[PDB]
Write a protein that binds this ligand. Structure first.
Ligand SMILES: O=c1ccn([C@@H]2O[C@H](COP(=O)(O)OP(=O)(O)OP(=O)(O)O)[C@@H](O)[C@H]2O)c(=O)[nH]1
Ligand SMILES: O=c1ccn([C@@H]2O[C@H](COP(=O)(O)OP(=O)(O)OP(=O)(O)O)[C@@H](O)[C@H]2O)c(=O)[nH]1
Ligand SMILES: [Mg+2]
Ligand SMILES: [Mg+2]
Ligand SMILES: [Mg+2]
Ligand SMILES: [Mg+2]
Lengths: 272, 272
């Protein structure tokens, strides 16, 4: 009985691909229009049934915690001016059945180290990992799509998307074999292959459902990719081509396209 | 001998027109592409000859201070990975002839109270005021244009822009008389007039050069507009229609247009 109720948000990194905006502000707090990247990722997890949110964070990232906590002085200001609609955007941003906890990563030693850092809070359960700089706009939350596959197949699941072959140098690419239309069994993961040498055009994105067996593989490993490759030998790992549109907001170019696209879709904002 | 060397940046406000992005992050830190609003405003002041930067700030706004201070852990990370170009975006963001100081505003009691809060650091000098949510893209820094007028005429100067008459309800509008092509003498300021009743279509923007005489008028006043109206009786106040394009980034709509426009101009980013 596979139950995924915990989601890990690695948010301890330095955000260097987005300077100077991120000199003194977490990349995860940068807004797509009027909402931080981390809020979209959290809402997706909650919408997929996650109840326990685990942030692996750092000294200079208090804004992330403060964003999901009460802000009493602001809530007092809004009540005082009678702006009760705004009060609802701020108060109880998370529903009452969800809880958050935070863990300091010693140093920014990698995504793999960040995942390993969450092990005491996760225990032996399977768990989700979401990278907030991958903003996904989907009719059905992408993490829900991935969890459903992981439960049905009793294995780990990597969210993948089709990319142009000429761009494979930018991603981790799975070598995999189809099992059904959207789901493939992973046999290898290759970091940043040449286009002509890429085994598939399926790039790993920042959405994972992982069995707790991953933790031991990361202690011998610092790269989550290498941990996953080790796991492949013991346990089943699948890739799932999810339905949705990803924007890579780790850099200004994808952030900009997300701003334009969700600007139009959700806000009625159109380039003048 | 009129010398404007000090600029005041009111940055203590709650940013409520941009929630939830600003729940736990200052509005002034929100980026236009890859740079915070406050950095554009500061760069404009420095480019106009300002040497003394005065921030009127609040408890939850440490990111602003941290942005203009050294970030040693980040500078160590960038040197360690040999990324010396990025090191230049972060280290000495301000030239060596400029200095910053910070003053806590007791509570967010208004722009007029914020200006008055800076009085001990300003002394009897004329001084600039810039509101970072007014992002101005100009060939010649707008504050320089305003200072030049203030020195030449030995009076205070309000930056104004022509707005559509149907939008006058959104702004403070000067009643004024032309003295030369871009410069007018102010006789009244009317807050948010009906279009058919607006005295002109010249709206005050977030750029001021003010004589120290303003401070006494704000102690009897909490609205900078009312302080300026009092000053008009004693001293000369001019409005200057500056050359430049303003974006009102206090809200998502103008921020979005700034993102599109400066995205294209400075970053090569074009809506897909
Ligand atoms: O040591 C680390 C490294 C990375 N991460 C987290 O892994 C995710 C994916 O890592 P990214 O490479 O997308 O983000 P980054 O902040 O490390 O970016 P750069 O400086 O390299 O430009 C991000 O959400 C990051 O916060 C950690 O939590 N800890
Ligand atoms: O008490 C105050 C009020 C305003 N200000 C500063 O005055 C400038 C113009 O004030 P704005 O109205 O543009 O900003 P705000 O943050 O007050 O916004 P809302 O909550 O009303 O949406 C902003 O730069 C603000 O920081 C202060 O410094 N202190
Ligand atoms: Mg990284
Ligand atoms: Mg990334
Ligand atoms: Mg205000
Ligand atoms: Mg404003």
């Amino acid at each position: 009985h596979h139950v995924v109720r915990k989601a890990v948000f690695p948010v301890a990194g330095m955000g260097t691909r987005f300077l100077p905006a991120t000199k003194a502000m977490p990349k995860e707090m940068l807004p797509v229009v009027d909402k931080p990247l981390i809020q979209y990722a959290v809402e997706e997890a909650v919408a997929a049934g996650i109840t326990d949110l685990i942030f692996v964070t750092g000294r200079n990232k208090r804004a992330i915690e403060d964003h999901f906590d009460a802000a009493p002085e602001l809530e007092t200001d809004l009540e005082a001016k009678g702006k009760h609609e705004l009060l609802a955007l701020v108060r109880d941003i998370l529903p009452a059945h969800v809880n958050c906890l935070y863990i300091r990563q010693s140093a920014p030693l990698g995504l793999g180290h960040a995942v390993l850092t969450a092990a005491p809070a996760v225990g032996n359960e399977p768990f989700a990992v979401l990278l907030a700089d991958d903003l996904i706009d989907a009719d059905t939350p992408v993490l829900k799509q991935l969890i459903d596959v992981a439960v049905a197949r009793q294995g780990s699941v990597l969210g993948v998307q089709e990319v142009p072959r000429e761009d494979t140098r930018k991603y981790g690419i799975v070598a995999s074999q189809p099992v059904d239309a959207r789901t493939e069994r992973v046999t290898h993961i290759v970091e940043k292959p040449a286009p002509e040498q890429a085994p598939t055009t399926l790039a790993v994105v920042g959405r994972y459902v992982l069995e707790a067996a991953i933790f031991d593989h990361l202690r011998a490993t610092i790269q989550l990719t290498d941990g996953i490759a080790a796991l492949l030998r013991e346990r089943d790992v699948y890739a799932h081509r999810y339905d949705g549109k990803r924007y890579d907001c780790g850099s200004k170019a994808g952030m900009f396209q997300a701003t334009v696209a969700l600007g139009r879709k959700y806000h009625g904002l159109i380039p003048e």
